[PDB]
Design a protein around this ligand. Structure first.
Ligand SMILES: *CCC1=C(C)C(=O)N=C1Cc1[nH]c(Cc2[nH]c(CC3=NC(=O)C(C=C)=C3C)c(C)c2CCC(=O)O)c(CCC(=O)O)c1C
Ligand SMILES: *CCC1=C(C)C(=O)N=C1Cc1[nH]c(Cc2[nH]c(CC3=NC(=O)C(C=C)=C3C)c(C)c2CCC(=O)O)c(CCC(=O)O)c1C
Ligand SMILES: [Mg+2]
Ligand SMILES: [Mg+2]
Lengths: 475, 475
């Protein structure tokens, strides 16, 4: 990705809806500031000046915070009607100010948050849990759209939940390309779980001096809430017809699972408290996704565990896999397959729904001349072996694993073609600029089967280990 | 348990710090009421009277709630300075009123709750997570003591965290008998996760009429917050020197994991909001306990999975288990054992630290004349086989499993004695009344090893399945 090279974490500028101040940990001395600082705190700070009580009324609370082991500082500056926040960046304190929450009770958030935390510890369906999470953020945020964006393995995303006022187009069930959120952006959103763009056509406020006197470097704005965004994304937002946006990162098992992406037809800001309330709903959803994944994976390994047990003691041999109706049923269910080919030399045994003997014969030749270490798995065989499109209907996906390289022996599982129409939020394929159109773009995905789960690949590799060793013993 | 027979869920009376009203779902008609109702709502309701706006200002909100699918009703009656709550009980609405929270911001709770939710999604150590949870409840509740009570397998409990003002004795690390919380109490606390006794010497307020006209039965007060407690527990609290108590249920994977038990030297009440804030911290802790248990169990099965793999292909045979230093090391590590006896007929093979050949010989005779189905496991062999105390130091715990009933073959793992002093909160063994003394009571637990984990028992049963079938093949 060429767009993945832009350093979005060091723009040296912020958005209009707040001001930024950089203090030296030791002296609490002014090192850098936004040109709009004076406008917000009604007090001009020269670079080198030491922050006193006169300057900042909260200086004694900030000093006590920094000495502490709390990651972030938050203070309600009642006098100026400002929300003050700060984080640690090496030997620096990056302090940010924004207009305070203009009327909103904590029990308004607390009360509406409990309704979801209580809902999704009973541990219901995910879809329903996703929607409930989206529907909450939608309420407290007040955005014209609040959708949940689940990342795929290729880092393309599929909209799995949606709440809206009706002012913005509905994207529920739409798929978006990986380039919409480039790698370095995905990496930043993994560690920094919040971001807000109240106005797409904000005029960036420079931070001066450009070079920080303490570090001799530009400011690391990775954890700056006011950080000026990448122009290419603003251009993207303008094309989507979104004047304002806010997104919360859903981080599960240390990885970026998805986003709670909120958009608005016209400029729209959210209070520090409400933003933290949304980051908190994202963590509740995150806590649940992990458990259901953990339990569904556990249930699957138990289910395949019962099947493996019957096969392993059935062999203790090929009639342990091929014996009668029961043995062959277990062979296919072992990895949730519809067919299997057990090829031991020139002896072919086809179970359930398989390609022709000749077609399977040609597949083993194609596999043999490729570096197939333990097992080869794909849910789209046609993608690498175009010839396989002829029997896509019976074997769109396979798990192939050799049991005796010397004898040219293989156990291959087959999965049939599962046809589905992929709704794309515009044309995927089409300095790089964002696409102007986001109209439902449909493609018929052919020659692709249901994906192979990790429990299934684990069960496959385990049966291979049992077969290999028997053949080793017999030979 | 004879104390486990008392029906604590139908006392037909409440505590003094609130009033209770029973309404018929259809008419919202008065069926039952506490004798102190008039005192609280300043309006006397005759049985048969229909609840109007004049009677209850919140009647239109309650009506809209009941029609809805929300489990519980909560309303802030500003006029009377009362917190109103209600739940569904068949065709009935059980409505309860108590004095409103006398000064406490939602951001006071919200702010102090986030500090723990943020702390324990980074997924640190449990002990630290337990203490952080206890230390929060201690702050918002304002109790003289806030401890976390982890239930054992025998339903005896061990204090694993503690926060206190110093006014009440410290019980951290103390163990309490199962009879302190009898079964029917444990069962109620599994479904009803909150309970509060602001004053131990409250005079129970009767509910009349005793018989509910709608059901022809006494009121099911399972989900009554004001429910009058069992006299034997109040007598228990008086002996502990606790005038007030509040406890939240920690429910993990559907089972009662433990309690957050709060006690106070003098009478002390907690607001509906703060009680719900504590029930909510208990769920945060609960969400975490489940994940660490889930991940620790996963990590263990992977670790033992690597060991099993080496043994299974090593046999493919007894030299697969007994071959050299590596094979024998894996045999012991398979279930985290220090010794093993592989007895195949009259042929004995002792690995690592085992009892004498004769001692193991006598153990197989004792096992043979007991209904040992698949495997027999214990962390205290002396408890059932007193003779085994002679070699408690080498084999305090064992996993024994026969591999050929016809040949009298066995694989037995040995774990050495791990001596520890069990601190008891009073004398465990000593109409039944509670013990008067809760002074640290010490016993030296001898002839007991580290407990056998489920992954270890699973790994044991799996190796048995591999050995059996080989011996079947060889024989
Ligand atoms: C460089 C080219 C590029 C193309 C072409 C493109 O489509 N996007 C980029 C770059 C890019 N994108 C972002 C950040 C970002 N993307 C999205 C995507 C999104 N929001 C939605 O609502 C939907 C679908 C419904 C999609 C697919 C979001 C949410 C964000 C984060 C900001 C926000 O919440 O709006 C960046 C990084 C911007 C920055 O942080 O500076 C870049 C460079
Ligand atoms: C019938 C005899 C009996 C003996 C003897 C005894 O010790 N307890 C009973 C009965 C019993 N206990 C309870 C409820 C209860 N027990 C505890 C225990 C406890 N609190 C602590 O702080 C510690 C240690 C530090 C222990 C071991 C708690 C917390 C509770 C719940 C109420 C509370 O929070 O105090 C009942 C049921 C009471 C009821 O709900 O009506 C009974 C019958
Ligand atoms: Mg995904
Ligand atoms: Mg326990």
């Amino acid at each position: 990705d060429s767009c993945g090279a832009e350093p979005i974490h060091i723009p040296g500028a912020i958005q209009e809806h707040g001001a930024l101040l950089v203090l030296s940990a030791r002296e609490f001395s002014v090192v850098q500031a936004s040109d709009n600082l004076a406008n917000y705190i009604g007090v001009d700070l020269p670079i080198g000046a030491v922050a006193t009580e006169a300057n900042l009324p909260f200086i004694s609370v900030l000093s006590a915070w920094y000495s502490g082991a709390a990651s972030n500082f938050r203070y309600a500056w009642a006098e100026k009607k400002l929300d003050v926040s700060a984080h640690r960046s090496g030997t620096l304190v990056i302090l940010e100010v924004e207009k305070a929450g203009v009327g909103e009770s904590a029990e308004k958030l607390m009360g509406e948050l409990t309704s979801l935390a209580k809902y999704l510890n009973s541990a219901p369906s995910l879809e329903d849990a996703l929607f409930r999470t989206a529907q909450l953020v939608s309420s407290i945020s007040g955005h014209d759209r609040t959708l949940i964006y689940d990342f795929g393995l290729d880092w393309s995303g599929h909209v799995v939940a949606e709440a809206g006022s009706g002012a913005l187009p509905s994207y529920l069930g739409l798929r978006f390309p990986a380039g919409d959120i480039p790698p370095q952006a995905r990496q930043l959103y993994t560690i920094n779980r919040l971001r807000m763009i109240p106005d797409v056509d904000y005029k960036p406020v420079p931070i001066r001096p450009e070079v920080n006197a303490e570090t001799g470097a530009v400011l690391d704005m990775s954890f700056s809430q006011l950080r000026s965004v990448s122009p290419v994304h603003l251009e993207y937002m303008r094309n989507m017809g979104t004047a304002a946006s806010m997104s919360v990162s859903i981080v599960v098992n240390g990885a970026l699972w998805g986003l709670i992406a909120c958009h608005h037809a016209t400029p729209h800001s959210v209070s520090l408290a409400v933003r933290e309330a949304c980051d908190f709903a994202a963590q509740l959803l995150s806590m649940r996704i992990a458990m259901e994944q953990s339990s569904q994976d556990a249930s699957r390994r138990v289910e395949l565990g019962h099947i493996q047990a019957r096969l392993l003691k059935g062999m203790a041999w090929v009639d342990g896999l091929l014996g009668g109706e029961g043995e062959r049923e277990d062979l296919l269910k072992q990895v949730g397959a519809d067919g299997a080919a057990l090829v031991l030399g020139d002896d072919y045994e086809l179970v359930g729904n398989t390609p022709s003997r000749e077609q399977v014969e040609e597949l083993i030749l194609w596999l043999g001349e490729r570096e197939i270490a333990d097992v080869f798995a794909t849910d789209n065989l046609a993608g690498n072996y175009p010839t396989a499109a002829a029997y896509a209907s019976v074997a769109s996906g396979i798990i192939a694993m050799r049991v005796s390289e010397l004898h040219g022996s293989w156990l291959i599982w087959f999965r049939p073609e599962v046809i589905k129409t992929v709704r794309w939020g515009g044309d995927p394929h089409k300095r790089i600029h964002p696409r102007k159109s986001f109209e439902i773009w449909k493609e018929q995905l052919r020659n692709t089967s249901f994906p192979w789960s990790e429990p299934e690949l684990a069960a496959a590799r385990e049966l291979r280990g049992a077969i290999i060793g028997i053949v080793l013993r017999k030979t």
